[PDB]
Amino acid sequence: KLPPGWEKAMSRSSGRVYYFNHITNASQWERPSGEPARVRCSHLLVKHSQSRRPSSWRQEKITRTKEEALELINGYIQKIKSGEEDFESLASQFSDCSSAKARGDLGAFSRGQMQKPFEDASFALRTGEMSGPVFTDSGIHIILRTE
């Protein structure tokens, strides 16, 4: 039927069909378009109190809850999808990862290098596609596949 991870769903507000990816947590109205040894991605990380290291260049002691971090992630996704903000600009300003200084870019990587939920989402994304919230032990991520 559909590319890997994608399933059809029903909107509760509008009653129209949409599409959801259970590997990337991406969702969209239109039927998705459609594996390499390597992909290239950028990300925006929002850390919280249960993160492996509750610290970042933005905050010596990160105290926000997991629920608060998810709300921030959802808000960044909204601004990116509406075009009020670009992914790289939000990543440079607000990602709790050191890669913020490189507009979130992590470079190219293979399977077996990143944390598993991050890796699975990255390889399920198409070039140019962005994930929904992805949970790892670092925190909550938005991932943009660039190559």
UniProtKB/Swiss-Prot annotation:
The protein's matches in Gene3D superfamilies, at most eight in alphabetical order, are given as:
2.20.70.10, 3.10.50.40
GO-annotated cellular components = ciliary basal body; cytoplasm; cytosol; glutamatergic synapse; midbody; nuclear speck; nucleoplasm; nucleus
Positions of the PpiC domain: 36-147
Organism lineage string: Eukaryota, Metazoa, Chordata, Craniata, Vertebrata
**EC number of this enzyme:** 5.2.1.8
* BP GO terms, sorted: cellular response to hypoxia; negative regulation of amyloid-beta formation; negative regulation of cell motility; negative regulation of ERK1 and ERK2 cascade; negative regulation of protein binding; negative regulation of protein catabolic process; negative regulation of SMAD protein signal transduction; negative regulation of transforming growth factor beta receptor signaling pathway
| Tissues showing expression | Expressed in immune cells in the lung (at protein level). The phosphorylated form at Ser-55 is expressed in normal breast tissue cells but not in breast cancer cells.
PROSITE patterns, A to Z: PPIC_PPIASE_1, PPIC_PPIASE_2, WW_DOMAIN_1, WW_DOMAIN_2
**Annotated compartments:** Nucleus; Nucleus speckle; Cytoplasm
Entry keyword annotation includes Ribosomal protein: no
Write out the function statement from the record.
Answer: Peptidyl-prolyl cis/trans isomerase (PPIase) that binds to and isomerizes specific phosphorylated Ser/Thr-Pro (pSer/Thr-Pro) motifs. By inducing conformational changes in a subset of phosphorylated proteins, acts as a molecular switch in multiple cellular processes. Displays a preference for acidic residues located N-terminally to the proline bond to be isomerized. Regulates mitosis presumably by interacting with NIMA and attenuating its mitosis-promoting activity. Down-regulates kinase activity of BTK.
Protein name according to UniProt: Peptidyl-prolyl cis-trans isomerase NIMA-interacting 1
Assembly behavior:
Interacts with STIL. Interacts with KIF20B. Interacts with NEK6. Interacts (via WW domain) with PRKX. Interacts with BTK. Interacts (via PpiC domain) with DAPK1. Interacts with the phosphorylated form of RAF1. Interacts (via WW domain) with ATCAY; upon NGF stimulation. Interacts with PML (isoform PML-4). Interacts with BCL6. Interacts with FBXW7, disrupting FBXW7 dimerization and promoting FBXW7 autoubiquitination and degradation. Directly interacts with RBBP8/CtIP; this interaction depends upon RBBP8 phosphorylation.
In which organism is this protein found? Homo sapiens
Chain ranges of the WW domain: 1-34
